[PDB]
Design a protein around this ligand. Structure first.
Ligand code: Y4H
Ligand code: NA
Ligand code: NA
Length: 491
């Protein structure tokens, strides 16, 4: 009797294992299959889906012991989708050296250590009591455990499969259970009638890949999808022209960017990276494609960071003439530089690129698009410029300047950014320092090096736009996920 929900999506994640699926496409699926110890109550106090309040979820109760540990008292009688009782053994395994942050774990869960704080091994005190802690002071543990790092996995089942096989047949405690997946096509979930919280309101949820937004909007209009993702503010005119459809959007805690393969000779030094950055007139892109709804950050700095947000920081300058000078100095010889984009996987990716191509022409640089189809992974050696995004997944400046751009992490190790020694020393400091002036001072210097080095160019915080049938009552949240608990009803 419950209605079946059909969501037209931009893509599917590479895995449904909670960490390996961290992407713009994963959380919207992963958040239904799993629960964390702590959950973000996005709509608390009438908030329009952007409240940061963290509430009990698989942890019935929790108390901070000191500056580096929290005791969690677990909800009793919670079952995983395979009938198994969720216990402290499962929570300890989820945040253990074996599964997440140990040397052997990061070979199969590659960002398990990169994204984690300085964990120490969890302590199981009893069946429903577990202490989670860091070796060094950290007032961010609650924030990590309520983020996309937090989903609790079943110990026996996950171990008997391994992270990647688990990622294709996930088992969690969440309100929807995995039914099936067809690679690069769809994922279907079904109501978990054993759920401990709000009873699921959809019989099934199907995430159907419709890579082209043009076809996705047409599918919504023709009655094929109840909700569609990854639209732009300019899609309002077509969608809202229909009385039974509407767009629903919000500013999300994500950053659209372009970055470089710094192993490539032309981008080994900061000179052309900075030239590409200074040639971009971001207010003009935000006015032309985002209806002035996207936000331009003032450095690698967001109000979401709270105590480590710097409101007085000046934004990076649009400086066409200086970009011209930097191009000439760099030795650039007019060779075409490619910019790889998987179509409009990122909302406004292709129109923003075309506007930046004209801005780059004005600076004396030839950039050409290299639009690749879904399921056609280009090799790193073929990449010069590429687009990317970073979810700003903690209310703290550590994510993602440190979690992505820090020492030993992907931008330096895979994409070859030669960060100054000073940057890597300060990344290590902000992880071990408690909230304060020294931590803020270190983030100020890290942001100055980041702006000077330009390993990536921050475009804007997107205004994420969805569209839906007016009979589907659901509000977007300020993050790259979809929340349906207490937020999905039909009629
Ligand atoms: O959707 P994305 O912008 O990037 C995804 C990537 O995560 C995924 O593995 C890949 C193949 O499926 O497709 C995209 O490049 O996700 C980023 C993620 O890469 C990053 O780790 C995270 C935190 O910075 O932010 C996401 O927004
Ligand atoms: Na060249
Ligand atoms: Na949402």
């Amino acid at each position: 009797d419950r209605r079946a929900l059909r969501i037209g999506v931009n893509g599917l994640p590479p895995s449904l294992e909670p960490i390996n699926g961290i992407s713009n496409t994963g959380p919207r699926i992963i958040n239904q299959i799993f629960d964390a110890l702590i959950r973000r109550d996005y709509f608390a106090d009438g908030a329009k889906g952007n409240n940061i309040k963290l509430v009990p979820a698989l942890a019935e109760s929790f108390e901070r012991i000191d500056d580096k540990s929290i005791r969690f008292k677990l909800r009793q009688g919670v079952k995983f989708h395979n009938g198994a009782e969720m216990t402290a053994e499962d929570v300890a395994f989820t945040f253990s050296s074996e599964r997440l942050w140990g040397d052997e774990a990061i070979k199969t869960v590659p960002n398990g250590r990169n994204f984690s704080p300085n964990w120490d091994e969890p302590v199981v005190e009893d069946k429903y009591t577990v202490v989670l802690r860091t070796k060094t002071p950290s007032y961010l543990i609650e924030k990590y455990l309520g983020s996309w790092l937090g989903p609790i996995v079943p110990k026996e089942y996950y171990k008997s499969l391994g992270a990647v096989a688990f990622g294709n047949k996930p088992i969690g405690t969440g309100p929807y259970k995995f039914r099936e997946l067809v690679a690069n096509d769809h994922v279907t979930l079904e109501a978990n009638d054993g759920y401990w919280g709000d009873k699921p309101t959809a019989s099934t949820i199907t995430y159907q890949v419709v890579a082209e937004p043009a076809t996705r909007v047409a599918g919504l209009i023709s009655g094929e999808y109840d909700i569609i993702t990854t639209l732009t503010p300019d899609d309002m005119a077509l969608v809202d022209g229909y009385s039974d459809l509407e767009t629903r959007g919000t500013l999300i805690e994500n950053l659209h960017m372009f970055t470089f393969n710094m192993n490539q000779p032309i981008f080994q030094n900061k000179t052309l990276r900075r030239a590409l950055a200074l040639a971009v007139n971001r207010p003009l892109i935000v006015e032309a494609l985002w209806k002035n709804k996207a936000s331009i950050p003032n450095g690698f700095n967001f109000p979401h960071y709270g105590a480590t947000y710097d409101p007085k920081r000046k934004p990076m300058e649009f400086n066409l003439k200086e970009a011209k000078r930097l191009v000439k100095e760099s030795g650039y010889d007019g060779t075409p530089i490619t910019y790889h984009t998987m179509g409009n996987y990122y909302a406004n990716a292709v129109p923003a690129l075309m506007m930046m191509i004209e801005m780059w022409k004005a600076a004396g640089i030839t950039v050409v698009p290299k639009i690749f189809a879904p399921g056609t992974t280009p090799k790193d050696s073929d990449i010069l410029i590429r687009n990317w995004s970073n979810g700003q997944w903690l209310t703290d400046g550590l994510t993602t300047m440190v979690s992505e751009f820090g020492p030993g992490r992907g931008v330096q190790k895979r994409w070859g950014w030669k960060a100054p020694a000073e940057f890597n020393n300060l990344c290590d400091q902000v992880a071990q320092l408690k909230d304060g002036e020294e931590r803020s001072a270190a983030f100020n210097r890290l942001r100055d090096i980041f702006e000077d080095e330009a390993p990536a160019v921050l475009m804007y915080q997107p205004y994420d736009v969805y569209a839906a049938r007016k009979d589907v009552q659901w509000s977007p949240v300020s993050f790259e996920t979809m929340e349906f608990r207490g937020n999905l009803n039909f009629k």
